[PDB]
Amino acid sequence: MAHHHHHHMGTLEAQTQGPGSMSAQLEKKVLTPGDGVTKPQAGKKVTVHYDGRFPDGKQFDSSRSRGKPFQFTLGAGEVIKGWDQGVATMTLGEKALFTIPYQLAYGERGYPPVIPPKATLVFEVELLAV
């Protein structure tokens, strides 16, 4: 009788183990759903918030604990298209886990030894208001 013995034991072939294929990866997992009826529009100054996080799960820093909301014109070149899309696709009162591929962010360049060059970095995007 076939009862699928499913068990995350290990990986014989890793195929460069990580968050996935070493390319433009984009996963979006909402931590807190928003109004849903509210609609973010371009051209407007929006009130956002971010959290730096590794694809592993371990957070870089809980900037949410810092209680600092940032503001920028949605649709403008204030931030990378990644974050622009993140806030543009979300709703008010909502926060989601938005995977930013290294090619779009500084993750490619790295900069500090904390971020290994060409590292895809996850940012929790949070739209407080407009």
Active site residue 70: no
Q: How many CA atoms lie within 13 A of 53 on its CB side?
A: 22
Active site residue 50: yes
35, 54, 106, 115: the catalytic one is 106
Active site residue 72: no
35, 56, 61, 84: the catalytic one is 61
50, 51, 100, 115: the catalytic one is 50
Active site residue 98: no
Closest CA to 105 of 125, 90, 91, 89: 125
Active site residue 61: yes
54, 70, 72, 80: the catalytic one is 80
Distance CA 122, CA 56 (A): 9
Three-state DSSP class for residue 61: strand
* Token pair belonging to 61: 């820093």
* Token pair belonging to 56: 């592993």
Active site residue 123: yes
**Backbone φ and ψ of 84, nearest 5°:** -55, -50
Closest CA to 84 of 68, 72, 67, 94: 72
54, 60, 70, 72: the catalytic one is 60
Q: Which residues are catalytic?
A: 50, 60-61, 80, 106, 123
